[PDB]
Design goal:
Two copies of one chain form a homodimer. With about 140 residues, chain A is mostly helical. Chain A has helices at about 5-30, 35-40, 40-60, 65-95, 100-135. Chain A has one domain (about 1-140). Chain A is elongated and about 70 Å long. Chains A and B meet through α1 of A and α1, α2 and α5 of B. The PDB classes it as signaling protein.
C-alpha cells in the first residue's frame, strides 16, 4: 500500500474546496456595492484563509513531478493576479471610481478568479488520475 | 476491490466542496443590500446547483451503515431548514422589508447553513476513516 498519493489527493481536494469557497465569497463582495458586506463575512473569511494556509503548507513539498510543478507555478502566477485585482476593485470602489471598479472586475478580476479555480481543478484531476493508475498497476499483484 | 470507499469519499468531497461554495455564495447574497448580485452570480450558481444535484444522486444510495445514514438523515433534515430560511430571506428582501430579512438571516439561515456544513464535514471525516480501514492487507 502506497497511501501517500492518497494523502496527496486529500490535501489537494481540501485546497480546491477552501479556494473555491474563497473565490465564491470574494466574487460576491467585489460585485456588491454594499460596503458593509466585507465586515459581515470577515470572520468566515478568516477561517478559510487559515484552512488554506494549513492545507497549502502540506502539499507544496509533495509537488515534485514536472506536470505537477507546472500547474503549481501557473497557480502561483494567477493567485498573485487574483489578489491584486481583488484589491484593485476594493480600492477603486472605496475611492469613488465605480465605473473603473466594475471594469477592473469584469476585465481583470473574474478572469483571474476563474483561472485560479480552473488550474486547481486541473491539479485535483491530475492527482486523481495518478492514484487511479497507481492502483491498476498495484493490481498486477494477481 | 476497494473502489467503493474511494468512490464514496471522492463523491462526498465533491459534495462537501459544492455545498461549501453554495453556502458561502448564498450568505453573501442574503446579506448584500445590492440586489445586482443575484443576476450576476446566476451562472456560477446554476453551475454549482447542477454539480450538487448530480453528486447527490450518486452518493445517496451508497450511504448504508448506521453511522453514515445517521449523519445523512440529519443532513437532509437540516437542509430542509436551510432552503426554507434561504427562500424566506429572499422574499423579505424582494418584498422590500430588509430589516426583517436580516433578522431571519442571523437567527435562522446562518444556524442552518453552519449545521449543514458541520454534518457534511463529519460525513467526509467518517468516510475518510472508513477508507483508511478498508486498507487491510
Amino acid at each position: 500500500m502506497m497511501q501517500e498519493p492518497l494523502t496527496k489527493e486529500r490535501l489537494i481536494s481540501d485546497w480546491n474546496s477552501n479556494v473555491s469557497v474563497a473565490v465564491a465569497r470574494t466574487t460576491a463582495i467585489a460585485k456588491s456595492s454594499d460596503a458593509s458586506l466585507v465586515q459581515f463575512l470577515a470572520a468566515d473569511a478568516a477561517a478559510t484563509t487559515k484552512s488554506t494556509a494549513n492545507v497549502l503548507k502540506q502539499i507544496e513539498p509533495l509537488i515534485t513531478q514536472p506536470a505537477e510543478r507546472e500547474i503549481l507555478d501557473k497557480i502561483m502566477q494567477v493567485r498573485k493576479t487574483y489578489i491584486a485585482s481583488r484589491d484593485k476593485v476594493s480600492q477603486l470602489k472605496a475611492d469613488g471610481m465605480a465605473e473603473e471598479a466594475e471594469s477592473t472586475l469584469i476585465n481583470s478580476y473574474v478572469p483571474a478568479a476563474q483561472g485560479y479555480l480552473k488550474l486547481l481543478g486541473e491539479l485535483l484531476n491530475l492527482q486523481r488520475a495518478s492514484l487511479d493508475a497507481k492502483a491498476a498497476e498495484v493490481e498486477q499483484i494477481e
